[PDB]
Structure 1
Amino acid sequence: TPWSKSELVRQLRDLGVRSGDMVMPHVSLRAVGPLADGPQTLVDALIEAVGPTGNILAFVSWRDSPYEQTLGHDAPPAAIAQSWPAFDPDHAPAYPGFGAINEFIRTYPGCRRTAHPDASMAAIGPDAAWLVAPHEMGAAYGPRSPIARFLAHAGKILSIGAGPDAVTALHYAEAVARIEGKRRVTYSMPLLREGKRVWVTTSDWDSNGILDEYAAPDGPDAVERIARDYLARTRVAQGPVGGAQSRLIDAADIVSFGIEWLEARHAA
């Protein structure tokens, strides 16, 4: 029997979600189980749980991000530069690998989208515009990014059946951590500025591992190692959301732990 919207709202309430909260969900729909009206039932429940003054922030990225196609180049290769679609924030589908719920969040009426094609964030609520902008190339997840403002607004991270590797906010911790040998990457993104496609090439911290030892693809990254150590040492509200075991995490607390975690193991 599929989970109803009212059943999920009660579960979110038991977990500690309050009206007015700013919540960032990481969802495994298969862990949740069948819903009354598909994934939209959970989206409606998330919006009701945070209330009209609350906010939802999701890391949705872009299904057709030219990340690997322009990685390590001072400019987009010619074939990529001539034909790749410009990132149209209100029309670009989310990256499926980060959760099928993100395409439902992203198309919700009133949802705003950041202009960073690879690190794109979707936001719903009164603070949606303030969260999504600015989001410039070179500030994917560190200061001046939606995550930074999310951390300055008592944000809560809502893992719904997702693994510890899915804590996007911890990319802020590795962006500001004062450690040696932080990996950087160079890539190009096609922005849509006043209807005109503009190619922008930038450098930023590697979001696939801030250090060499954390960047192997086989392969727990720094986010997963930090999150597991945090969840092993911290009392965190846990409970069911649908059929998925869920956690409500204080975003500023796990990021502070992440900074201390990185700086304790690597010199400055």
Structure 2
Amino acid sequence: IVASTQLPNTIKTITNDLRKLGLKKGMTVIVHSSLSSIGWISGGAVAVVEALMEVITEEGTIIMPTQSSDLSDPKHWSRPPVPEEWWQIIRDNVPAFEPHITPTRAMGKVVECFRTYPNVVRSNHPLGSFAAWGRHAEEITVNQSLSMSLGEESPLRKIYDLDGYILLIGVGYDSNTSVHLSEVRSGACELIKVGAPIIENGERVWKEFVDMDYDSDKFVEIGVEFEQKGTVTMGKIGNAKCRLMKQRDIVDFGTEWFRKK
């Protein structure tokens, strides 16, 4: 990242970049990131978390998805998949989700760092959890539904209700979790029978439930079109191409988009 960078990215410079882009105090923002994309950072992930906190403050709210899809029913694993003989073994053995414990997958280093921070709170979903910090942290994360995990009873809906923002740091619309709310609303996806391990009555139980067969693959196309409207702000955090936008704007657009096929 070194060659790609003039002078170090720091907490300070990131805070600059953030405010430049339009972030400020008191804002409600869900954040999606690629650490590497920014360039060389003095402090790495910590520096990004710290800068985000410094801009937003305790008076605002930072959210990130903390997915742990590796806890899911492997019959549904299509990349990569695993031998079918492995399936029951998995169901019988994979350890239970616990918010204060279970690592994320495919979320990134900023997320992993964020998750561990003091006063960060994580929702209680074994597969599709979110973490949050600040004013509306609890409100956003509490009482996530097991079934329809990214639906109307989810952190996505809470953010919507709050007229929050989405920030993409060096990632694409396919990383844009909120658009899953669009899939839900539009009924864009088949319902599937799923499973995951949870703690019930202080013991591990493999829980069967129902959710949408979420597919972000389609989100890239959606975002392009969405961006024709011209309501997405853009700038750089270090080397990172960033986008800032209203969650409601994109979610509404998405829902509509899906309805039209």
Q: TM-score, normalised by structure 1?
A: 0.86
Q: Specify which of 104, 122, 133 is matched with residue 113 of structure 1.
A: 122
Whether 1:43 aligns to 2:49 is: yes
Cα–Cα, structure 1 residues 16 and 243, in superposed 2: closer, same or farther, change >3 Å? same
Judge conservation of contact 2:73–2:91 (CA < 8 Å) in 1: no
Q: Pairwise CA RMSD of aligned residues?
A: 2.0
Long gaps (5+) in structure 2? 1-6, 79-85
Contact 2:69 2:128 in 1 (8 A): no
In the alignment of these two chains, the number of paired residues is 248
Q: Distance in 2 between matches of 1:66 and 1:235?
A: 36
1-structure distance, mates of 2:136, 2:14:
24
For 1:43, give the aligned amino acid.
V
Letter in 2 for 1:93: P
The answer to which of 45-54 and 232-241 deviates more is 232-241
2:197 equivalent in structure 1: 190
Percent pairwise identity: 30
Distance 1:67 1:82 in 2: 11
CA-to-aligned-CA distance 1:132-171 (integer Å, 9 cap, x gap): 1111211211100110111111111000110121111000
How big is the shift at 1:68?
Answer: 2.5
Within a 5 Å distance, the mapping from 1:1-268 to structure 2 comes to 1-62=7-68, 64-69=70-75, 78-95=88-105, 97-177=106-186, 182-208=189-215, 221-265=217-261
Tell me how far apart the structure 2 counterparts of residues 46 and 69 of structure 1 sit (CA, whole Å): 38
Aligned partner of residue 227 in structure 2, secondary structure? helix
Structure 2 Cα separation of the partners of residues 57 and 6 of structure 1: 21
Please identify, of 190-199 and 253-262, the stretch whose mean Cα deviation from structure 2 is larger.
Answer: 190-199
CA–CA distance in 1 between the matches of 2:8 and 2:200?
A: 43
Whether the 8 Å CA contact 1:69–1:80 is kept in 2: the answer is no
Counterpart-to-counterpart distance in 1, 2:130 and 2:200: 18
**Runs of 5+ unmatched residues, structure 1:** 210-220
Quote the offset at 1:77 in angstroms: 5.3
Deviation at 1:49, TM superposition (A): 1.0
Task: From the superposition, tell whether residues 5 and 256 of structure 1 become closer, same or farther in structure 2 (CA, over 3 Å).
Answer: same
Measured in 2, the distance between the counterparts of 1:77 and 1:64 equals 12
Q: Which amino acid aligns with 1:249?
A: M
TM, length-normalised to structure 2: 0.89
